[PDB]
Amino acid sequence: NCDCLNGGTCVSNKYFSNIHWCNCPKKFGGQHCEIDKSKTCYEGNGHFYRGKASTDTMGRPCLPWNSATVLQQTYHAHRSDALQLGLGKHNYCRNPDNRRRPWCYVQVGLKPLVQECMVHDCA
Q: Do 60 and 119 fall within a single domain?
A: yes
- State which approach was used to obtain the coordinates: X-ray
Listed resolution, Å: 1.9
Q: Do 109 and 57 fall within a single domain?
A: yes
Interatomic CA distance for residues 119 and 57, integer angstroms: 8
Cα-based angle 28, 34, 36 (whole degrees, multiple of 5): 40
Residue 82, helix vs strand vs coil: helix
Q: Do 74 and 115 fall within a single domain?
A: yes
Q: Do 7 and 45 fall within a single domain?
A: no
Handedness of CA 108, 112, 114, 118 (dihedral sign): positive
Burial class of residue 81 in the structure, from the number of CB atoms within 10 Å of its CB (0-12 exposed, 13-18 middle, 19+ buried): exposed
Interatomic CA distance for residues 121 and 109, integer angstroms: 29
Residue 41, helix vs strand vs coil: strand
Interatomic CA distance for residues 22 and 11, integer angstroms: 6
Q: Do 46 and 36 fall within a single domain?
A: no
